[PDB]
Amino acid sequence: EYLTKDSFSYEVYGIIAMQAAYRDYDSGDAKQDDNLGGMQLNNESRIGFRGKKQFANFEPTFIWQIEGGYVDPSFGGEGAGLGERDTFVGFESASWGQVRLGRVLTPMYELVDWPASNPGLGDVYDWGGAIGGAKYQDRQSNTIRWDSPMYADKFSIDAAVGAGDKAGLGAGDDYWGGIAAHYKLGPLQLDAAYEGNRNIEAEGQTWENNTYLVGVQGWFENGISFFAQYKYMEADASNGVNEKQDAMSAGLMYTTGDWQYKLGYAANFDLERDGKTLSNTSDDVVSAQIMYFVDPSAVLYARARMNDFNEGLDGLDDAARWTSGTNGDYNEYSVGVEYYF
Amino acid sequence: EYLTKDSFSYEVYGIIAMQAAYRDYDSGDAKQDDNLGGMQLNNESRIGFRGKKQFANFEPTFIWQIEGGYVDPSFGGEGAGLGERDTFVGFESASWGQVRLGRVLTPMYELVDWPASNPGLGDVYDWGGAIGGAKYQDRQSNTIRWDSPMYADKFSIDAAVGAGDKAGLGAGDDYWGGIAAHYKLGPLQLDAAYEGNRNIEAEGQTWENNTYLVGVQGWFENGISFFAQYKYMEADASNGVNEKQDAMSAGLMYTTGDWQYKLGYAANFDLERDGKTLSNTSDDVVSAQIMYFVDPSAVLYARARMNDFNEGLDGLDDAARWTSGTNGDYNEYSVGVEYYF
Amino acid sequence: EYLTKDSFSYEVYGIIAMQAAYRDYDSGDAKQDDNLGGMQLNNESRIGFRGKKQFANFEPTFIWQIEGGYVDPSFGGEGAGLGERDTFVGFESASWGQVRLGRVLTPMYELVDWPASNPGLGDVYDWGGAIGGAKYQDRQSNTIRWDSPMYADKFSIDAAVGAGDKAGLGAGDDYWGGIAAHYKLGPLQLDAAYEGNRNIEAEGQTWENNTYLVGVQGWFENGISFFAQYKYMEADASNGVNEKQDAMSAGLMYTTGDWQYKLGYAANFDLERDGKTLSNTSDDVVSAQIMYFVDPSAVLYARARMNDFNEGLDGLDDAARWTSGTNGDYNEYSVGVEYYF
Ligand SMILES: CCCCCCCCOCCOCCOCCOCCO
Ligand SMILES: CCCCCCCCOCCOCCOCCOCCO
Ligand SMILES: CCCCCCCCOCCOCCOCCOCCO
Ligand SMILES: CCCCCCCCOCCOCCOCCOCCO
Ligand code: NA
Ligand code: NA
Ligand code: NA
Ligand code: NA
Ligand code: NA
Ligand code: NA
Ligand code: NA
Ligand code: NA
Ligand code: NA
């Protein structure tokens, strides 16, 4: 008659996240600036379901999750389905960690996103950049991913392979594989990652991409913390063209009582095609944030950032290649709340 | 081990609503009548999640809600995302009421919908009418809305501002602001509202709209209740054209034991453009309903209505302006159930 | 303060289902084979809500359900809305069974799907076939369905009528009706069903379809179980053309301890148009499966199947008629898990 934790085979969880963001664009076209700029709300709130089950006849515990998408992001319409964010089944056991099948972050993307896309560094460092093909996937369906245990309390590995975007619709044979490693050393964590994408169809060619990342995170007792990463992207097209572009991201934090101050910087350097530097193909971003720990489950923040994007380039089909800079440079001021349950 | 109300940081709620609706169209084209008319089911059922949190370091209580859309409405395909209906975050405190950010009803729209679009008066009084620009938003994303407390147990105010439909996609600079007030006087409630829409792009112009509303609702001890509203819509286009149209809606109810009888009527009067009446631009609807209070949480109803729409007009670009009458006049018989938990 | 079953007016339920499926196509075009074939994950996981209410003033119990769609199927993108699968309201009472309004399986479709489309026989026997018009609906909105009680513990009937696919959007006047009956006697069940579709618009004509089904299922105590069905499809177009096609499906199972071995076969025979057999319009599939009962609430399985589809035909507008064979023959190896809560 009376319920316990065991009465249910699932848990609802949520991230309630609302940002009010004012953008000021300087694209060169005043109408486009009026259109893209101004105040919006960016509602990144999402609901998920998850659970576990010890099957009677198999030792590794079954796990599963189904996570909804952002319910009303800026620049988009209302509503999200279930299964748009990390959504998987899997198994776990103490001695070998976990394996997940479904829709998860790639090992490389996970590091690109956290720590290195925060606060607002993502237009440059996440999906920014000018390279052809596919530098990496991000959250990707049709994936198998292994997460190792924390060996000797210090070292862990994440490895995955998956189908590409066209392959997932029965429209291509693209695929990828990736791996990351993490090592904890006193106040530091060292990070390294790789992703290779193959059979990528774009601009009339087939591409292979290889992306490499090295990074550090540190947390010191006097309240200073930081991160830094360097990311190296290479791409080869089936007509013989080679491209390379590198990038970096860094952040510095000072935490005192219920406050975190943060500065962030990220940059993509000029792209190189067949040994030649394409001028003005770099991007950068500077960001400042103050965050208040309003509760153990929530934060309030204020943020200011300035994005200075590349001036454009063509792809290998002689048409403009789309980048995060195609819509122009902008600055943004924002405030927000996030709450976790 | 045993659960309480406090074990969860969310509540699921729902409105389970099904209507079987038979429409008989008289559009002037027999094939169109056959297509638009006939029996459908209108499943307006929806699920929502909501909760609150007292943040340790902030006095006003945090509130949130994520509401799904109608799961299978008539004239539409199956399935709704989370966040299609009222979906927001906010804060509340006894002395100042509540503030919500996200997707909510405008102050004007809320009164236009309830009481004045029920039962089935909405084709005329909600989204019906012939005026250019945007007479008002309805449920709108990118909104901040304040709801005052009930001052002196009599008077309350709802005020809001938000981004327009194009601005929410980064495709324009439309916006709007609105306010409503409610005053209790014996068995009556008096209502007034305003909305102003700006930078609305349509028919090759930019438009400003101003809409005003005044109303009454009454509930008497002998079982009679009623509502009546008058609504005045004005619009100015950037080429100098002015338009005006007004409207009304009224309803009379008799409640006895577990039954409510209801008659409803709404009309849009002829539109005026630059001081000249456009003939046959009016609409009206008459509706009758019997409702049974089948449970404290539910109702059953039967409803009959007749819609007589305008005979068409052009917009300022010399093409037909779409209205709720464009698909033709129709009558409708329906039965339904609604249940709340 | 403490919660019971009665504290909630709804239950969450789910089917967590993941299949890893490798397809090898032989379409005649090596690029198309590369595109459609390869490994995908087919995530058929879904979440639902359901509940009941005894209304104070009505004896038949109110029932409802809202079921989400597959969260990330193969050949499709991520995310599903609530209300994509069986989503309805209804009433139930011991003496007359249940009545549902909304989105449910048709009586014919329910038998076509289970037992007769498992394991992987659906390309041929569910949506396969070459006949014009609409052989039957499957899961359909705008439906009323009655499920009788089990009379004398042996005999039951399911009957339904509904609006068609165009009618549901206000774009046509299609409709259907169907019925099925089941008789249980010792270790056998006999099945029979019918569906008639009317006013179906396709290929420049209006169609009527009539589809008939007879079947048997058996379950014996020595671990042998089986099913077999015969399905007869007839269609008449408004220009006088008659089409007929028949089909079958059968399966044999052997269950011992926690294992089920299964073989399945289904076929569509050559279609006949105006008394003439259209050569090479048949399809068939053979499938083998081993299933392990890993828990009382879950299964693991491995499956191999070979599909051999028709070589194409034209519809009555002299263009290719789409069938489940249009993309070419393929074989498939898969493994999966399903778990129910
Ligand atoms: C980007 C890297 C940021 C590094 C932040 C500083 C980390 C720690 O600095 C404080 C050093 O702690 C040792 C204290 O040294 C002073 C000791 O003086 C003598 C008293 O015993
Ligand atoms: C302690 C680490 C210090 C690292 C300093 C290296 C900074 C590199 O800055 C230049 C990279 O290019 C980014 C600037 O791009 C701006 C956009 O350019 C407009 C036309 O491309
Ligand atoms: C508080 C009592 C409210 C009394 C409501 C009376 C409403 C009168 O009916 C108006 C509907 O008129 C329908 C057709 O008339 C068209 C004339 O156009 C100009 C409007 O004055
Ligand atoms: C369409 C033809 C498929 C026929 C397969 C029938 C095989 C079933 O074997 C039954 C023999 O049973 C011997 C053992 O009986 C144990 C008690 O069973 C009670 C009835 O299930
Ligand atoms: Na804008
Ligand atoms: Na939005
Ligand atoms: Na991708
Ligand atoms: Na119709
Ligand atoms: Na519908
Ligand atoms: Na709007
Ligand atoms: Na493929
Ligand atoms: Na998929
Ligand atoms: Na259908």
Author numbering:
A (entry chain B), B (entry chain A), C (entry chain C): 10 to 350
Direct quotes from the study:
The gene encoding for ChiP is found in most marine members of the Vibrionaceae, emphasizing the general importance of this OM diffusion channel for chitin utilization. The addition of micromolar concentrations of chitooligosaccharides such as chitohexaose (GlcNAc6) causes a complete block of ionic current, demonstrating tight binding. Here, we report X-ray crystal structures of VhChiP in the absence and presence of chitooligosaccharides.
Subsequently we cloned VhChiP without a signal sequence and with a C-terminal His6-tag into pET28a to express the protein into inclusion bodies (IBs) and avoid toxicity issues. VhChiP from IBs was folded in vitro from 8 M urea and purified as the native protein. Well-diffracting crystals (~ 2 Å resolution) in space group P21 were obtained and a SAD data set was collected at the absorption edge of Selenium. In vitro-folded VhChiP forms a trimeric assembly of oval β-barrels, each consisting of 16 strands, like the general diffusion porins OmpF/C from E. coli. Unlike OmpF/C however, the N-terminus of VhChiP does not form an intramolecular salt bridge with the C-terminal carboxyl group. Instead, the first N-terminal 17 amino acids of VhChiP are not part of the barrel and extend into the periplasm where they form a trimerization motif like that observed in the phosphate transporter OprP from Pseudomonas aeruginosa. The first nine amino acids of the N-terminus are disordered and not visible in the electron density. Thus, five out of the first six residues of the N-terminus make polar interactions with the pore of the protein, suggesting that the plug is stably inserted in the pore. It should be noted that for in vitro-folded VhChiP, two residues (MG) were added to the N-terminus of the mature protein for inclusion body expression, and it is possible that the presence of those additional residues has destabilized the plug sufficiently for it be outside the pore. The N-terminal ten residues of in vitro-folded VhChiP are highly flexible and do not insert into the pore. Consistent with the experiments, the in vitro-folded trimeric channel shows a theoretical conductance value of 2.13 ± 0.15 nS, only slightly higher than the experimental value of 1.8 nS measured at lower voltages.
